[PDB]
Amino acid sequence: SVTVRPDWVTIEEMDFPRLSKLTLPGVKEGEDVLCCGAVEYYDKSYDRVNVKNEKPLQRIDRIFHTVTTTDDPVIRKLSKTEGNVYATDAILATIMCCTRSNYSWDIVIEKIGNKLFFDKRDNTEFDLLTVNETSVEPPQDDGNSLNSPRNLALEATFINHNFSQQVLKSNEPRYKFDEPNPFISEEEEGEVASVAYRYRKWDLNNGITLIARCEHDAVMQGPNNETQFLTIKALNEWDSKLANGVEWRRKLDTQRGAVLANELRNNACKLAKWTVQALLAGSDQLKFGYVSRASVRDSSKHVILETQQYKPNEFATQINLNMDNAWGILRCIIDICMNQKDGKYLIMKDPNKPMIRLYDIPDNTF
User: Listed disulfide bonds for this chain?
Assistant: First the structure.
């Protein structure tokens, strides 16, 4: 993800077995500090989609923001009066789920006085979803191929953008939070994706107060007119034979469990990060779509085969995601950084080894 330079100094490194043993129990639910944006309502007709009643996936033309912490004008303003550590849910999920990661990644941490800002670099593949990252044999094709890791990542990201919006009531008013979406002009309110943000606060002990941007994709009217908030994601199938997977069209109907088990093992980091995003936001449900290519030789046309719903805390149990561990990992990295001088630091995942390394880097590096 990044080229280590000769003047970078290793501060501390930790292997996955030790990271897996970190623990910070007793962390309370996030507390909302500011809520903004606007979401569309879920279209429950997508709950009746199944392999015998597939629905083509539509191309949706909307604005999808992925703004890093220090570029976020709400975080910038909040940081003047609240907290001492700042991040976004996507950045936190990468750190919290690091022991499930295979592919390289990095996060820049800036220390300014008693404050830490966690950022992603914008020019990288940080935002793209990975595909078969944790398979025994991850995708092997070289650049050109429709099945190269990068092209699969672009396809899955595209699918998720489309799916998350398609299953909503696009032609109906939104559920609005108190403040408007902080990333757009009023003129773009009709163009922006369905997304609402909760900027939330956690006490992580040791004088640490985290403020992070969390989000929901949609709202839904619950059992008795109760407003529920949703995280909506798409699992995808590209070529079951080349993936050595279980064929969704053949198995979703009767062997849903086997299909899901295969996803848990072959996309372990992706799925854990989504679950962390839902937990941090306090989403009532995680909704998964199952999207497949219409034809395995064409990555431009897709179909929705099925949708599933989980309570995030129950799904976490199913994938053995333990938030005591997630919070422990984050606090460990925070402690390493708080012991340093003001300046820039970098945490990164070794491309070939199960470990993370925190570097002291020249402050003009990034």
Answer: none
Q: What letter would DSSP give residue 263?
A: H
Whether 266 and 251 have beta carbons less than 8 Å apart is answered as no
What values do phi and psi take at 229, rounded to 5?
-110, 140
Residue appearing with tokens 């309110």: 189
Q: Which residue has the tokens 């550590």?
A: 85
Taking the C-alpha atoms of residue 207 and residue 360, their distance in angstroms, rounded to an integer, is 23
Beta strands in 155-224 (DSSP E): 175-176, 195-203, 209-216, 218-221
> 279: Cβ–Cβ under 8 A, 6 or more apart, which residues?
312, 313, 316, 323
Distance of CA 152 to the CA centre of its chain: 17
| Closest by Cα among 268, 26, 248, 289 to 132 | 268
Q: Residue 209's CB: how many other CB atoms inside 10 A? A: 14
**Edge-to-edge strand list for the sheet holding 31-39:** 9-15, 355-360, 343-349, 106-112, 115-119, 85-88, 209-216, 195-203, 31-39, 175-176
Burial class (CB in 10 A: 0-12, 13-18, 19+), 330: buried
Rounded Cα gap, residues 363 and 192, in angstroms: 35
- In sequence order, the β-bridge partners of residue 85 are 116, 210
Element (DSSP H or E) covering residue 355: strand 355-360
Structural contact between residues 116 and 152, judged by C-beta atoms closer than 8 angstroms: no
Cβ–Cβ under 8 Å, residues 344 and 365: yes
Work out the burial of residue 343: count CB atoms within 10 Å of its CB; fewer than 13 is exposed, 13-18 middle, 19 or more buried: middle
Helices (H), 21-115: 73-78, 89-96
Cα(341)–Cα(362) distance, integer angstroms:
12
- Beta carbons of 303 and 292 less than 8 angstroms apart: yes
Q: What does the alpha-carbon distance between residue 97 and residue 22 come to, in Å, rounded to a whole number?
A: 12
Structure tokens at 273: 């990060």
Q: Report how far apart, in Å, the C-alpha atoms of 167 and of each of 97, 232, 233, 260, 314 are.
A: 28, 9, 11, 21, 23
Q: Alpha-carbon distance 163 to 289, whole Å?
A: 7
For the CA atoms of 64, 67, 73, 77, the dihedral, rounded to the nearest 10 degrees, stands at 130
